[PDB]
């Protein structure tokens, strides 16, 4: 029976997991204790009749997880599941990959091993982290590396923060970002790269909230993950599992980087005054100004599009919207995909948290396009890392940590080769 295990790493992983888990609890009706006054894909029953989240929060700093430990859901969560470290990497991939990992690699591996023992038929491993933090980078790299040989066939979804092209919370982020990409290339099945700046622009423009926060962002991340998992959780006319939409997204072993989009995202006051229907929501999913990654697909060509409707929706309207979007010259397709859509429908509308921002809306849409327009962000990162490595700044930190400096040039060349492959597809 379908099961998805959370392997969230870092401060981003902890906050995003707490978000996603309040949405899972409100969706399944579970009280903050863990008692019910569908669920089994995420929860698990106990002798006491409680429901156990199948999440592994791992961090190198205590306080980020102790906030959860003294949070509301303390009795809901497992003291053993929450894995903490005493000293962090402090935005150092080398620290995160070579010096501090091996202390708790075994503990994290044992925790996910017992969770997989509890699960009967494992569908997927949803793994959340960031490309900026030394923890969320190096630890994610090593756990992908060991998890690949621990489970060869089990699918590993990779949700991760990518550094924003303009704003940044770190200076030493590009070194970790270039050194991490090897694991998301050779140890990942799907990757869901996200930069904060895009969601910042979206929530300012559409949601009318002039002063949002990380929990406002995490609300939409939980929403998109929930819409991904809704077909597994509840019934649909065309249920879509993980295997189906990875097969109809990944043409080659080297191309597993789709871009996502959620529609409709409007506040309640503006939601008062418009019809929300299939055509409008699928047109909003295609606007370059609504894309959650800072790139224009109009500068590239779509070669795959996974599609997840939700709520009150009819396949007649789905096919009409597909015809309408196909009849558009601004939207391009590569020559080797006359048919490049993967349509799924689910019955239950997306639920709403109190204190959130999106209004309750009867029909929603999640779009996952694999295109070639993402490579320009990697090109920007390549220029930034090149002018980093030209003067060999911050190299002494990693060298004292103990890695070999040729790996930097190797990672740069590897990402250049990935961009070249994307050019060959394009």
């Amino acid at each position: 029976m379908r099961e998805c295990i959370s392997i969230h790493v870092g401060q981003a992983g902890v906050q995003i997991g707490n978000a996603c888990w309040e949405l899972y609890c409100l969706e399944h009706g579970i009280q903050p204790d863990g008692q019910m006054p569908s669920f089994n894909t995420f929860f698990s029953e106990t002798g006491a009749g409680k429901h156990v989240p199948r999440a592994v929060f791992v961090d190198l700093e205590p306080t980020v997880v102790d906030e959860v430990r003294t949070g509301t859901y303390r009795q809901l969560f497992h003291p053993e599941q929450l894995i903490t470290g005493k000293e962090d990497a402090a935005n150092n991939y080398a620290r995160g990959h070579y010096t501090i990992g091996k202390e708790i690699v075994d503990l994290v591996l044992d925790r996910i091993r017992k969770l997989a023992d509890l699960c009967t038929g494992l569908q997927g491993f949803l793994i959340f982290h960031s490309f900026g933090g030394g923890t969320g980078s190096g630890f994610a790299s090593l756990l992908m590396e060991r998890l690949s040989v621990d489970y060869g066939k089990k699918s590993k979804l990779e949700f991760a923060i990518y550094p924003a092209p303009q704003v940044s919370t770190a200076v030493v982020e590009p070194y970790n970002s270039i050194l991490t990409t090897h694991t998301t290339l050779e140890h990942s099945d799907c990757a869901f790269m996200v930069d904060n700046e895009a969601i910042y622009d979206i929530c300012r423009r559409n949601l009318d909230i002039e002063r949002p926060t990380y929990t406002n962002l995490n609300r939409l991340i939980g929403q998109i993950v929930s819409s991904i998992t809704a077909s597994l959780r509840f019934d649909g006319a065309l249920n879509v599992d993980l295997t189906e939409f990875q097969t109809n997204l990944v043409p080659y072993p080297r191309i597993h980087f789709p871009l996502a989009t959620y529609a409709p995202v409007i506040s309640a006051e503006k939601a008062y005054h418009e019809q929300l229907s299939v055509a409008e929501i699928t047109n909003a999913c295609f606007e370059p100004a609504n894309q959650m990654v800072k790139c224009d697909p109009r500068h590239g060509k779509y070669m795959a599009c996974c599609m997840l409707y939700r709520g009150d929706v009819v396949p007649k309207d789905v096919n009409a919207a597909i015809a309408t979007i196909k009849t558009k010259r601004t939207i391009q397709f590569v020559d080797w995909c006359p048919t490049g859509f993967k349509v799924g429908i689910n019955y239950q509308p997306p639920t709403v948290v109190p204190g959130g921002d999106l209004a309750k809306v009867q029909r929603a849409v999640c779009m996952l396009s694999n295109t070639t327009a993402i490579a320009e962000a990697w090109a920007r990162l390549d220029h930034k890392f090149d002018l980093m490595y030209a003067k060999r700044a911050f190299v002494h930190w990693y060298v004292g940590e103990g890695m070999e400096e040729g790996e930097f040039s190797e990672a740069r060349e590897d990402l250049a080769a990935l961009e070249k492959d994307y050019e060959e597809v394009g």
């Binding site: 707490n18 409100l26 089994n40 509301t72 509840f234 019955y347």
Partner: protein
């Protein structure tokens, strides 16, 4: 050389100075509400079964500490605790009505199949 005949009375002068400046602890026993360390007794030792009274406010301290933030504070304090602050569902969860709240939780022969997979 260390002229201890002078040095010791320099130390005596100092000891008298912080003796004048010495202030006693004001007998305000505070304890961390985080955790305390304890030692298990011997159940049979004919001194260990001695009846002795407990404290009445410490129990209130734990019963207040081991509880969520909402009943602790009238208003929020940190942005990490805005999250899940109000668990009140704005409409009643009529989760028994299959008409509008269709659920795919395991039903009918699929429960037996979950048993049969083992």
């Amino acid at each position: 050389n260390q002229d201890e005949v002078h040095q010791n009375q320099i130390l005596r002068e100092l000891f008298l100075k912080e003796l004048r400046a010495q202030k006693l602890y004001t007998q305000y026993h505070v304890n961390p509400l985080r955790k305390v360390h304890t030692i298990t007794r011997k159940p049979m030792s004919w001194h260990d079964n001695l009846e002795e009274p407990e404290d009445a406010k410490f129990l209130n301290l734990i019963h207040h500490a081991a509880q969520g933030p909402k009943k602790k504070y009238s208003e929020t304090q940190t942005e990490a605790q805005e999250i899940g602050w109000d668990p009140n569902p704005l409409i009643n969860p009529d989760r028994q009505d299959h008409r509008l709240n269709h659920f795919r939780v395991y039903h009918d022969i699929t429960l037996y199949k979950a048993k049969l997979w083992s």
